[PDB]
């Protein structure tokens, strides 16, 4: 698929980017320290504004065009909010070790299945929307789609 029409490749690489960035964090964490423990919230709390952004920009720009022309919509492009007031919680409610600890767990066990529902959200949108959006507009309004997508990412 050409580059000049490709609205999900450049946005994924920068959200598959975040997500090993915070893999990383995650494992080298100590989350006994309170230091390193908020200062891993901080980091995950502005890279999940940065999805609920790119999510939002796709609703805005590609899939409530996409849907308009195909009408084949049926499933609804919430968890960002969800992982985010979580990040919340843990930045105010925690006040010592042991609620540090039993947090983590939870966090970890969250965090593991946002990202294992994350990728394949993201691998159905470049195997599917993308070739729908080649049947349903132009390519000329395809790079005008892409040049608004990577305006509002960059």
Not at 60 to 87: A, P
Not at 90 to 116: D, I, P, S, W
Request: aromatic share 12%; charged share 30%; hydrophobic share 35%.
């Amino acid at each position: 698929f050409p580059e000049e029409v490709d609205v999900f490749t450049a946005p994924h690489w920068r959200m598959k980017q975040l997500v090993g960035l915070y893999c990383d964090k995650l494992s080298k964490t100590n989350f006994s320290n309170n230091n390193d423990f908020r200062a891993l919230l901080q980091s995950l709390y502005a890279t999940f504004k940065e999805f609920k952004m790119h999510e939002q920009i796709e609703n805005e720009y590609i899939i409530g065009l996409l849907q308009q022309r195909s009408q084949t919509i049926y499933n609804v492009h919430n968890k960002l909010s969800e992982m985010l007031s979580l990040f919340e919680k843990g930045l105010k409610n925690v006040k010592n070790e042991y609620e540090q600890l039993n947090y983590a767990k939870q966090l970890k066990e969250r965090l593991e299945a946002f990202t294992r529902d994350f990728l394949p959200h993201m691998k159905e949108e470049e195997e599917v929307f993308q070739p729908m959006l080649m049947e349903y507009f132009t390519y000329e309004e395809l790079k005008d789609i892409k040049k608004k997508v990577i305006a509002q990412h960059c």
